[PDB]
Amino acid sequence: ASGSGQSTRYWDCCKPSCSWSGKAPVNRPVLACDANNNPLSDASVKSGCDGGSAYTCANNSPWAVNDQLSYGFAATKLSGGTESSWCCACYALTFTSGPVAGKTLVVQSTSTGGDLGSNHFDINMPGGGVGLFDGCKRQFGGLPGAQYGGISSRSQCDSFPAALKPGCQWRFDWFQNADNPNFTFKQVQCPSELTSRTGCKRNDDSQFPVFTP
């Protein structure tokens, strides 16, 4: 898949939808975590957003490699696709608007986003907003910030759980607090940096081009 799309930001702490078995042709589904960021090899644990105890791992956070390139994660809803075609796929995003215009973010899809424009990427970042399901309230008592869009000042990251602070600050640092920047995207082979965090690699990963930083 390739094309253009709109971005939002989120972190709801819920078990990612690609953490369920049988969703896509993969070696294994995305690792969810317990409330203390220990990975759950058992894909049957119920989502903390449904009264269970499985949450998004803190390592599903974005980070910068250099001033031009970051790696991270997103919830995707793509024209012509299904969960079976995007779960655990990677995509190189090139931003086309906002202060980050021209920068590159390579993401792995770990969940399904909502319909928003032609190709929505809901980009993971702690403190970007829980939205509809406040899993973080159950995981550790909640994150600060607006329901949609999350926190508004960088200092609000200071009270986050330790493992969520780097991703929280990335939003204000490399990402320049960009507000829903647009992008073009291309599906690519997943960098090992991403699959080593989620443990999930698509059987069709090699059908797509290698990403070159």
Ligand X SMILES: OC[C@H]1O[C@@H](O[C@H]2[C@H](O)[C@@H](O)[C@H](O)O[C@@H]2CO)[C@H](O)[C@@H](O)[C@@H]1O
Which residues bind to ligand X, rule: CB under 6 A? 8-10, 12, 114, 122, 128-131, 148-150, 180
- Nearer Cβ to ligand X (180/203): 180
- Nearer Cβ to ligand X (135/189): 135
Type of residue at 208: F
Catalytic residue among 12, 67, 115, 158: 12
End-to-end CA distance of the chain: 19
> Can 50 be counted among the known catalytic residues?
no
Type of residue at 98: G
- Nearer Cβ to ligand X (55/211): 55
- Min dist. Cβ of residue 9 to ligand X (A): 4
* Alpha-carbon distances of 202 from 64, 92, 170, 194, rounded to whole Å: 24, 16, 27, 12
**Which residues are 40's β-sheet partners?**
32
- Min dist. Cβ of residue 75 to ligand X (A): 7
* Burial class of 94 by CB neighbour count within 10 A (0 to 12, 13 to 18, 19+): middle
Tell me which residues are annotated as active site.
12
